[PDB]
Amino acid sequence: LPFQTRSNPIPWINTWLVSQIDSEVDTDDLSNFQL
Amino acid sequence: LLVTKRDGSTERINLDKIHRVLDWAAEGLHNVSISQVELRSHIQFYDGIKTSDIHETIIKAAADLISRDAPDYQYLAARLAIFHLRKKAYGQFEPPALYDHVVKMVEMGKYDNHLLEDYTEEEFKQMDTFIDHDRDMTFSYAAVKQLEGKYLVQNRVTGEIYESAQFLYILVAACLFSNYPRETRLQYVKRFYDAVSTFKISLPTPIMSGVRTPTRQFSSCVLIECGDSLDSINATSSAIVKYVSQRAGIGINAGRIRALGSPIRGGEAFHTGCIPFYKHFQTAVKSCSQGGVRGGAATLFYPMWHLEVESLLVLKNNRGVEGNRVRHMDYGVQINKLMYTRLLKGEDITLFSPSDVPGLYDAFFADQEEFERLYTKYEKDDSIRKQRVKAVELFSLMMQERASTGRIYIQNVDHCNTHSPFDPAIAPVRQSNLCLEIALPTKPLNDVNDENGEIALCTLSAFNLGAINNLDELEELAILAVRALDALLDYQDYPIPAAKRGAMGRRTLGIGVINFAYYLAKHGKRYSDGSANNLTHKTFEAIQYYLLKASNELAKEQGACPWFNETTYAKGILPIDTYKKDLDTIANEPLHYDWEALRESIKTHGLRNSTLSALMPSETSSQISNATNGIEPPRGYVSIKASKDGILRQVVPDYEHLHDAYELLWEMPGNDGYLQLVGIMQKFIDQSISANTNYDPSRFPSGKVPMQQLLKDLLTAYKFGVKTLYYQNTRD
Ligand SMILES: Nc1nc2c(ncn2[C@H]2C[C@H](O)[C@@H](COP(=O)(O)OP(=O)(O)OP(=O)(O)O)O2)c(=O)[nH]1
Ligand SMILES: Nc1ncnc2c1ncn2[C@@H]1O[C@H](COP(=O)(O)OP(=O)(O)O)[C@@H](O)[C@H]1O
Ligand SMILES: Nc1ncnc2c1ncn2[C@H]1C[C@H](O)[C@@H](COP(=O)(O)OP(=O)(O)O)O1
Ligand SMILES: [Mg+2]
Ligand SMILES: [Mg+2]
């Protein structure tokens, strides 16, 4: 490569170049819990 | 063709003037394009086009190019906008001298005249040496738009911007320490200016917007308690109106108002319900919410066992007549252990009007034992008007209204007094604020000027966790932050006497954190997996310890707060004693600081401030340092946030290096990992945390979010001692 690494200075050219809630509750499952 | 310069004169159109500016703003930046900005501007030239309109167009163009592939546009658009804002206030890029500017601004009535009374021209020129106007080149675009849109002193009818960013910083430092002794005044002014202008300390909207302006109100949170009387309702409405016009957000506690149908004056009148009064509180807020720094809002609180609770939960939903909807306020449902017990057992919950149950309300907050006694007693009393509801159904309604509206909040009132810095017998917490992170004592008012009432004010600030490189830097930061906020309490004005009484007797402060997600990314930890548990404990221990130590040393210098005896700190109790013991099963990190020696110094010399820590969302203020807001994980690598102009793109800090370390909001499998962290933080936080619950419907079978999960998460939040729950975000 003869030039320094560089980012694309015209990125816009690439356009042209490549073309309701589950209500159910289980209190026993909740009872398996200590506050 | 001709353009119209800023000074009115006209010259031949020259695109090289535009290349120069853009080349300047893009210098040093990686992967930006001068050509892109010019072409994406689609700048339509006409004869006589103003050169100011030209610049605003290329700012918008460069601002919308912020992306993952090109993050550095956040600084290209910022440097362009700073350049634009410099010309808007000064007519040039170079800012004037601090003295010449303050003189002109005090003369225009845009600054407070005390600036000339407290500082001499020799002192002002000495603070102009503190200023580094090149720190304007460290902002991101989102930061600059918040400065232009909210913070920088401006005219709200002209749109005329009056000051630069570094003048805002240095004068906030000058004013807050203006009342300091000459021997250490400019010493602190410089040190605090450096702290906030280099993003070690985050300052909230009212401080950024107001500290240096004539109208002195800088407390973000106003907490008003309403009694069950027209004189209190009138006083509450008047206090809301006063403080909403003063950059403040309101928290209303209308749980005492008797239910619909209750007798008035022994049956001379029929009580039409709470909702007609809630509508009055809403129009109080909305009457003068907008027009100032931003649109104020308010959150109303009521106990879950209230009789009208089934009608208050649905106040924000659209499906109903306007007579039964108060949509434009948020609501916080107050719950204690007994209410959750009824849910876990599948039993019922009895609803009372607070007027029919003597002492039941005060016990709901102060005395958890006495409440259960009165509750079951009144449940069996047949002479008391009551209403039984299946706890499974009442909770489903609330969590369902929390889901659809997103603004139905929850405050576990028993945790806010069992693990609080206040004695529930002396000064219980019966309320929270707009964003559910403030918990301070209140007493309702009889008049607008009732001396015996108490309105709770909290002044805020944040530590930038990304800005520190070692936790011991907080010791120095906590001193600077606490001192600045405490002197602010004496410096500002109080439109309501009862509010000044609370602010002066308790001197409550609320210092939080920002950039927490970037902080976990720098440590290679995540929210959900639980890898941040022990790190979070180590981090927030240092925060609270150095905050207490800073205010404890300040109590030595100027004396503890007048009502310090009402605090649990006065009795020698620390957060390390009253925290929720379930946290010990999710964190084995030990304490690292000498808490017992701090306990002795507090027992002896007291605390200048009754509260110090509270984790607020920092929705706007955190954007100044491009930090991830509060403790919430960023929504994306490039986040979309709102402003008065339009949408803003905000890159996560240090994106190029840490895009893998970040766990984005919707990359989290659930709330259990996050909620544990909030509980661990709450072990040390004086007040509360604006904790969000998040749900991705696509992560659930049949695409519907189960009520089982909404309740299981609400319980795991209480299990780890979480005081309050803020937003519930639902994806898409
Ligand atoms: N709908 C309706 N509500 C009222 C009326 N008068 C008072 N209220 C409400 C406001 C308060 O929440 C509650 C108590 O009102 P006050 O405490 O100002 O009335 P007062 O002390 O004269 O009688 P009290 O024995 O406390 O009911 O009733 C009325 O004429 N209509
Ligand atoms: N839209 C608003 N209007 C009025 N006050 C607000 C608003 N948003 C937040 N506040 C106040 O600021 C406090 C903390 O919220 P936060 O997001 O940290 O504010 P900021 O936007 O200044 O960072 C809240 O408790 C509330 O009192
Ligand atoms: N003759 C010209 N034709 C087109 N654009 C111009 C111009 N002169 C200046 N500009 C651009 C450069 C800046 O980005 C923008 C306004 O910047 P400025 O330096 O504050 O304005 P001015 O030079 O008109 O006082 O307008
Ligand atoms: Mg020029
Ligand atoms: Mg009365």
- Per CB-CB distance under 8 Å, the chain A contacts of B396 are 23, 25
List the one residue out of B350, B378, B354, B326 whose CA is nearest residue B262. Answer: B354
The helix (run of H) or strand (run of E) holding residue B537 is helix B533-558
Parallel, antiparallel, or unpaired for β B330-335 and B298-303?
A: parallel
Phi then psi for B694, rounded to 5 degrees?
Answer: -120, 140
* Residue B272 Cβ contacting ligand 1 at under 6 Å: yes
* Ligand 3 proximity of B41 Cβ (cutoff 6 Å): no
φ and ψ at residue B319, rounded to 5 degrees: -80, 85
Looking up tokens 């003869």, which residue turns up? A2
Residue among B341, B700, B708 minimizing CB distance to A26: B708
Q: Which residues of A touch B711 (CB under 8 A)?
A: 25, 30
Candidate from B1, B4, B10, B17 with most ligand 3 atoms within 8 A of CB, to mutate: B17
Q: Which of residues 367-426 of B touch A (CB under 8 A)?
A: 392, 396, 400, 403
Q: Read off φ and ψ for residue B729, nearest 5 degrees.
A: -90, 130
Nearest to B707 among A10, A12, A22 (CB): A22
Tokens of B406: 């997103």
| Chain A positions in Cβ-Cβ contact with residue B34 (cut-off 8 Å) | 9
Tokens of B166: 């570094």
* CB neighbourhood size of B613 (10 A): 27
Coil/strand/helix, residue B716: helix
Check CB contact under 8 Å for B30 and A7: yes
Listed by the residue before each break, gaps in chain A with C–N over 2.5 Å are 19
- Coil/strand/helix, residue B427: coil
> Chain B contacts of A27, Cβ < 8 Å?
343-346, 392
B703–A contact, CB cutoff 8 A: yes
State the Cα–Cα distance between residues B482 and B495, nearest whole angstrom. 23
Q: Angle at the Cα of B386 (from B384 to B389), degrees rounded to 5?
A: 160
Measured between alpha carbons, how far is B346 from A32 in angstroms, rounded to an integer?
12
Q: Are the C-beta atoms of residues B66 and B74 closer than 8 Å to each other?
A: yes
| Residue written as token pair 């939903």 | B317
Sign of the C-alpha dihedral computed for residues B464, B467, B469 and B472 taken in this order: negative
**Tally of CA atoms within 13 A in the half-sphere of B323 that contains its CB:** 3
CA distance B437 to B425: 22
The secondary structure of residue B316, as a DSSP letter, is: T
Q: Which of B35, B70, B400 sits opposite A10 (nearest CB)?
A: B35
Where does a domain end: B662, B677, B708?
Answer: B662
- The Å distance, Cα B289 to ligand 2 centre, comes to 13
Contact (Cβ atoms closer than 8 angstroms) between residue B613 and residue B685: yes
Q: What are the angstrom distances between the C-alpha of B103 and each of B76, B96, B108, B110, B124?
A: 33, 11, 9, 10, 11
Best CA proximity match to B142, nearest among B644, B666, B658: B644
Are the CB atoms for B170 and B196 separated by under 8 Å? Answer: no
DSSP states along B127-148: HTTT--GGGGGG--HHHHHHII
Instruction: Report the C-alpha gap between A29 and B435 in whole angstroms.
Output: 31
From the number of C-beta atoms within 10 Å of its C-beta (0-12, 13-18, 19+), residue B45 rates as exposed
Q: Which single residue is written with the structure tokens 């009253």?
A: B578
Chain B positions in Cβ-Cβ contact with residue A10 (cut-off 8 Å)? 33, 35-36
Considering the domain architecture, whether residues B60 and B137 belong to the same structural domain is answered as yes
Phi, psi of B659 (to 5 degrees): -65, -20
Provide the token pair at B586: 């999710």
**B331: helix, strand or coil:** strand
According to the 3-state scheme, what is the secondary structure of B219-246? CCEEEEECCCCHHHHHHHHHHHHHHHCC
- Ligand 3 atom, smallest distance to B12 CA: 1
- What is the secondary structure of B159-203 as a DSSP string? --B---HHHHHHHHHHHHTTTS-TTTHHHHHHHHHHHHHTTSEE-
**The dihedral formed by the CA atoms of B59, B64, B66 and B67, expressed in degrees to the nearest 10:** -170
Ligand number, closest to the Cα atom of B258: 1
Burial of B565 (0-12, 13-18, 19+ CB in 10 A): middle
Contact call for residues B313 and B339 (beta carbons, < 8 A):
no
Say if CB B411 and CB B432 are below 8 A apart.
yes
| d(C-alpha B711, C-alpha B717), whole Å | 10
Contact B626, B576 (CB under 8 A): no
> DSSP labels for B594-621?
-HHHHHHHHHHH--S-S--B-B---TTG
With b meaning 16 or more CB within 10 Å and e meaning fewer, what string describes A13-32? eeeeeeeebbeebebeebee
CB atoms within 10 A of CB B156: 10
> Whole-angstrom Cα distance, residue B218 to residue B210?
7
Interface test with A, best of B707, B714, B719 (most A CBs within 10 A): B707
For residues B391 and B475, membership in a common domain is answered with yes
Separation in Å, CA of A27 to nearest CA in chain B: 6
Please state, in angstroms and rounded to a whole number, the distance separating the CA atoms of residues B598 and B577. 13
Element containing residue B35 per DSSP (H, E): helix B34-41
B155 lines ligand 3 (CB under 6 A): no
Asked if B399 and B457 sit in the same domain, the reply is yes
Q: Is residue B46 located within the same domain as residue B93?
A: yes
Torsion sign (Cα): B82, B88, B89, B91: positive
Confirm or reject contact between B715 and chain A (CB < 8 A).
Answer: yes
CB contact under 8 A, A23 and B707: yes
Instruction: State whether B606 and B652 are in the same domain.
Output: no
Instruction: Please report which helix (H) or strand (E) contains residue B480, including its range.
Output: helix B473-491
The nearest alpha carbon in chain A to B716 belongs to: A35
What are the angstrom distances between the C-alpha of B536 and each of A19, B82, B462? 50, 36, 16
- Within 8 A by CB and 6+ apart from B86, the residues are B92, B93, B94, B95, B164
Q: Is residue B571 packed enough to be buried (19+ CB in 10 Å), middle (13-18) or exposed (0-12)?
A: exposed
Query: How far, CA to CA in Å, does B502 sit from each of A16, B220, B455, B719?
Result: 66, 14, 6, 31
Same domain, B552 and B592: yes
Chosen from A4, A6, A21 to mutate, greatest number of chain B CBs within 10 A:
A21
User: Are B707 and A20 in contact (CB < 8 Å)?
Assistant: no
Distance of CA B670 to the CA centre of its chain: 24
- Record: contact A30-B343, CB cut-off 8 A: yes
Q: How far is the C-alpha of B575 from the C-alpha of B722, rounded, in Å?
A: 14
DSSP structure class, residue B583: G
Q: Which of B457, B550, B562 is nearest to B216 (CA)?
A: B457
CB contact (8 A) between residue B31 and residue A7: yes
Place of tokens 């149950």: B357
Cα separation, B438 vs B222, in Å, equals 9
Query: Which of B248, B244, B239, B254 lies closest to B221, judged by CA?
Result: B248
Q: Give catalytic status of residue B515 as yes or no.
A: no
Q: How far apart are the first and last CA of chain A?
A: 67
Q: Which of B294, B450, B424 is nearest to B367 (CA)?
A: B424
DSSP β-bridge partners for residue B674: none
Residue B448's alpha-carbon distances to A22, B224, B380, B508, in angstroms, are 47, 11, 40, 22
B433 is catalytic: yes
Structure tokens at B314: 């649905």
Residue of A nearest to B402 (CA): A21
Residue with tokens 């810095």: B421
CB atoms within 10 A of CB B380: 9
Alpha-helical segments (H) within B245-366: 275-287, 309-312, 337-344, 360-365
The answer, for B28 touching chain A at a CB cutoff of 8 Å, is: no
DSSP string, B435-466: SS------B--SSTT-TT-B-EEEEEEEEETT
Say which residues have a Cβ less than 8 Å from residue B534's Cβ, sequence separation at least 6: B587, B588, B589
Axis crossing angle, helix B595-605 with helix B533-558, rounded to the nearest 10:
30
Task: State how far the alpha carbon of B123 is from the alpha carbons of B113, B118, B119, B191, B484, in Å.
Answer: 16, 9, 6, 15, 19
Q: For residue B257, give the ligand 1 atom closest to its CA.
A: 12
In B, minimum Cα distance to A30 occurs at B344
Tell me, what amino acid is at B196?
Answer: V
Any B CB within 8 A of A32 CB? no
Same domain, B400 and B453: yes
Contact criterion met (CB below 8 Å) for B496 and B448: yes
Domain count, chain B: 2
Q: How far apart are CA B698 and CA B202, in angstroms?
A: 36
Answer whether B44's CB lies under 8 Å from B58's CB.
Answer: no
Q: Which amino acid is at B34?
A: I
Contact yes or no for B502/B221 (Cβ under 8 A): no
Partner residues linked to B334 by β-bridges: B303, B411
Give the span between the Cα atoms of B640 and B380, in whole angstroms.
54
Kindly give the distance from the C-alpha atom of residue B265 to the centroid of ligand 5, in angstroms, as a whole number. 8
Identify which of B611, B283, B248, B243 has the alpha carbon closest to the alpha carbon of residue B434: B248
Identify any residues that bridge with B694 across adjacent strands, giving them in sequence order: B729
Check whether residue B526 and residue B644 sit in a common domain. no
Q: Which of the listed residues B11, B22, B54 should we mutate to test ligand 3's pocket, taking the one with most ligand atoms within 8 A of CB?
A: B54
- Cα angle B346, B350, B356 (rounded to 5 degrees) comes to 170
- Residues of A with Cβ-Cβ distance to B33 under 8 angstroms: 8-12
Quick one: B315 and B343 in the same domain? Answer: yes
Backbone discontinuities in chain B, residue before each (C to N > 2.5 A): none
3-class secondary-structure state, position A9: coil
Identity of the amino acid at B410 = I
Angle between helices B73-90 and B51-64 (to 10 degrees): 160
DSSP-derived letter for residue B630 is T
Instruction: Please answer yes or no on whether B392 and A27 come within 8 Å at the CB atom.
Output: yes
Mutate to test the pocket of ligand 2, among B245, B434, B509 (most ligand atoms within 8 A of CB): B434
Of B336, B433, B515, B609, the catalytic one is B433
Tell me the helices (H) and strands (E) count for chain B, helix number first.
28, 21
Q: Which residue range(s) make up the domain with B175?
A: 1-199+636-662
Q: For residue B224, report the phi and psi dihedrals to the nearest 5 degrees.
A: -110, 130
Distances (CA, A) of B464 to A28, B249, B472: 44, 23, 13
Which residues does A13 contact at the CB level (< 8 Å), separation at least 6?
none
Same domain for B534 and B680, yes or no, is yes
User: How far apart are the C-alpha atoms of B385 and B352, rounded to whole Å?
Assistant: 7
CA-wise closest residue to B423 among B564, B283, B301, B560: B564
Say if strands B456-464 and B221-225 run parallel, antiparallel, or are unpaired: antiparallel
Residue type (1 letter), B264:
I
Do residues B530 and B576 share a domain?
Answer: yes
Number of inter-chain CB pairs under 8 A, A vs B: 75
Closest CA to B628 of B34, B45, B199, B113: B199
Write the DSSP assignment of B638-687 as a string of letters.
Answer: EEEEE-SSSEEEEEPTTHHHHTTT---GGG-S-SHHHHHHHHHHHTT-SS
d(CA B11, CA B4): 7
> Could you tell me if B323 and B279 are in contact, meaning their C-beta atoms sit under 8 angstroms apart?
no
Q: Are residues B302 and B172 in the same domain?
A: no
* Contact between B36 and A24 using a beta-carbon 8 Å cutoff: no
The two three-digit tokens of residue B479, written as one number: 């001193």
Cβ burial of B699 (10 Å; 0-12, 13-18, 19+) is middle
Selection from B652, B615, B692, B623 nearest residue B205 by Cα:
B623
Is residue B379 annotated as a catalytic residue, yes or no?
no
For the domain that residue B579 is a member of, what is the CATH number?
A: 3.20.70.20
